């Protein structure tokens, strides 16, 4: 199962790591995706992934939108997790950067409470433009189900990990 993490909660873990190789290495039930609501899986974390499933991830994902239009920020779907997990669960978290409403960010952290276990990494941080710290709260706060929250940035890590009340 999970290895190395650090116990947050009775159902939150962190891990300084890198997502892709966490989900090639344990290939879990669900990845979490850093999705937008077009699944243009372009950079950060949703551009990582699709590049480890050589794009099936956006080809897949194209479809999808052909057939369902957009998600809504604060939504998600569930997609395959190709050679990464059995799913991929796209989550929207609102990208500060575009103005969106640092509010939906519980909103996406409520699609977790759907899955018993997921390795995921923290919505709206990195180039969504949200405050990881407050990413981390939110994330403690809303979901029930256990979370695997693998951290790229060892420093950011370390500031969420000794800031962590
Ligand atoms: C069976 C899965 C989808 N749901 C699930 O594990 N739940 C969300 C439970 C975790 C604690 S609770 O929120 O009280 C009920």
């Known amino acids: 199962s999970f290895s190395g993490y650090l116990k947050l909660t009775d159902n939150?873990?962190?891990?300084?790591?890198?997502?892709?190789?966490?989900?090639?290495?344990?290939?879990?039930?669900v990845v979490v995706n850093a999705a937008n609501?077009?699944?243009?899986?372009?950079?950060g974390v949703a551009?990582?992934?699709?590049?480890?499933?050589?794009?099936?991830?956006?080809?897949?994902?194209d479809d999808y939108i052909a057939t369902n239009g957009?998600?809504?920020?604060?939504?998600?779907?569930?997609?395959?997790?190709?050679?990464?997990?059995?799913?991929?669960?796209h989550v929207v978290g609102p990208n500060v950067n575009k103005g969106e409403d640092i509010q939906l960010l519980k909103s996406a952290y409520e699609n977790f409470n759907q899955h018993?276990?997921?390795?995921?990494?923290?919505?709206?941080?990195?180039?969504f433009g949200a405050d990881?710290?407050?990413?981390?709260?939110?994330c403690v706060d809303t979901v029930r189900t256990?979370?695997?929250?693998?951290?790229?940035?060892?420093?950011?890590?370390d500031k969420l990990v000794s800031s962590f009340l």
């Open 47 to 61: 551009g990582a992934l699709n590049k480890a499933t050589n794009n099936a991830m956006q080809v897949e994902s």
């Open 70 to 89: 957009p998600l809504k920020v604060g939504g998600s779907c569930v997609l395959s997790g190709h050679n990464l997990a059995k799913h991929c669960l």
């Open 146 to 157: 256990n979370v695997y929250l693998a951290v790229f940035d060892k420093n950011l890590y």
């Open 132 to 138: 990881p710290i407050h990413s981390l709260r939110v």
């Open 12 to 29: 939150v873990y962190i891990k300084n790591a890198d997502i892709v190789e966490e989900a090639k290495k344990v290939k879990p039930t």
């Open 116 to 127: 018993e276990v997921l390795l995921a990494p923290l919505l709206s941080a990195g180039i």
């Open 37 to 43: 609501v077009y699944l243009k899986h372009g950079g």
